[PDB]
């Protein structure tokens, strides 16, 4: 489930350094580059006030793009600690320098279970991503495409009636999910697999 | 556990030269970011330079490059600021800090250059 | 990367609430600090990561960000909160400070 997650993220530009985690308990940072030269880095981070440490930078290609990312240990990736990131080049350039709380750079997973049942509205229900604790605490948006209207929803809320619909409209729609609370922050996940509905007669 | 003593300010003639220490007890100093700061009389705060840890990597500002430089003996676990071409307006208060939580957590008491005619 | 804080100084009495502003430049991290001098010593940290509070720290002491504007607040002043204020901030290799907020008692 990894490789979609940090592509999607990507798309976030080159002069962010690109972190998520997954589970709270971890932390992966990652950019992208040219396949030119592959150029020489020094991953360093400091945790509060402790000793900064240095983090093993790894190599690897996607096609032609090459991309340098590095895992950072569960034991020093608390939540709501400061965590400072120093990419610098052998030169001593400073590539990126950062401050994340590990609370907010959550990237959820897709949700599942999406369904959709009808006269009057619409019900459309469905699951939070699976093996995710804190499930109630996620955040959810769903998309009514036909064109595109998206309708927003907060936190613990598996359901959704649509109001103000159509009739004799091919309907599509999905639903993302993302941690949202005063100490809980991140990307939008994935779009969840999209179910479909044709509207009565009207 | 911390502590930070400097050492080395005086008066100086315009021009002279000026070894600055700051002696770090409570910690590993090749293990942290240290960084010298000024502050001239009745003045604000002036960051000067930087050195970064396990690679001794050296950041100064514009006012101060070239005639100034950064250093660290991590034997003696000191920081050490060499100012050369100092001039008047370089009197001031020099620290050095630690740095910790994104900025700069432990001071030395700081050591005064005067720079007189 | 420019730090300008406003006001210069501000005179207040004890058990006032007081906000001091400081406005960056350039796209600028939340890596602000905040910090408090007295005549003589030092400077004596308070905030970090734009809003934490640095152990030890009262909890009339606040940080807030609003984009390009970080404001530092004591909640009510106290007699040993009188001193110059600091915001500081790092961007990729430099350090500024802002010019400096001194809050004098008003008597």
């Known amino acids: 489930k990894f490789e979609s997650k940090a592509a999607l993220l990507a798309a976030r530009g080159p002069e962010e350094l690109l972190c998520f985690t997954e589970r709270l308990e971890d932390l992966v940072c990652f950019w992208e580059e040219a396949a030119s030269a592959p150029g020489n880095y020094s991953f360093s981070y400091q945790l509060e006030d402790e000793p900064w440490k240095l983090c093993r930078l790894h190599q690897a290609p996607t096609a032609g793009a090459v991309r340098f990312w590095c895992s950072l240990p569960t034991a020093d990736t608390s939540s709501f600690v400061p965590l400072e990131l120093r990419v610098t080049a052998a030169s001593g350039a400073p590539r990126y320098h950062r401050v994340i709380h590990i609370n907010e750079v959550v990237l959820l997973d897709a949700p599942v279970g999406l369904v959709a049942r009808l006269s009057g509205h619409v019900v459309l229900r469905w699951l939070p991503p699976p093996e995710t604790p804190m499930t109630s605490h996620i955040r959810y948006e769903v998309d009514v495409s036909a064109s595109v209207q998206r309708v927003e929803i907060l936190e613990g809320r598996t359901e959704c009636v649509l109001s103000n619909l159509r009739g004799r409209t091919r309907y599509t729609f999905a639903v993302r999910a993302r941690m949202a609370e005063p100490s809980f922050g991140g990307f939008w996940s994935a779009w969840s697999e999209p179910v479909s509905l044709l509207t009565p007669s009207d | 556990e911390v502590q930070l003593v400097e050492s080395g300010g005086g008066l100086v003639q315009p021009g002279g030269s000026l070894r600055l220490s700051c002696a770090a007890s409570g910690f590993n100093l090749r293990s942290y970011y240290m960084h010298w700061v000024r502050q001239a009389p009745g003045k604000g705060l002036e960051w000067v330079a930087s050195?970064?840890?396990?690679?001794?990597?050296?950041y100064y500002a514009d006012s101060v490059k070239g005639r100034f430089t950064i250093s660290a003996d991590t034997s003696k676990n000191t920081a050490y600021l060499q100012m050369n071409s100092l001039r008047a307006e370089d009197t001031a208060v020099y620290y050095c800090?630690?740095?910790?939580?994104?900025?700069?957590?432990?001071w030395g008491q700081g050591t005064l250059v005067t720079v007189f005619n | 990367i420019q730090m300008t804080q406003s006001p210069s100084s501000l005179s207040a009495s004890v058990g006032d609430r007081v906000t001091i502003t400081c406005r960056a430049s350039?796209?600028?991290?939340?890596?602000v600090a905040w910090y408090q001098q007295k005549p003589g010593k030092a400077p004596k940290l308070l905030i970090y990561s734009a809003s934490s509070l640095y152990s030890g720290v009262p909890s009339r002491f606040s940080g807030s960000r609003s984009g390009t504007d970080f404001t530092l607040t004591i909640s009510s002043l106290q007699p040993e909160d009188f001193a110059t204020y600091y915001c500081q901030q790092s961007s990729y290799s430099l350090i500024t400070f802002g010019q400096g907020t001194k809050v004098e008692i008003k008597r």
């Open positions: 350039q796209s600028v991290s939340s890596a």
């Open positions: 050195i970064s840890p396990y690679y001794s990597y050296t």
């Open positions: 800090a630690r740095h910790g939580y994104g900025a700069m957590d432990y």
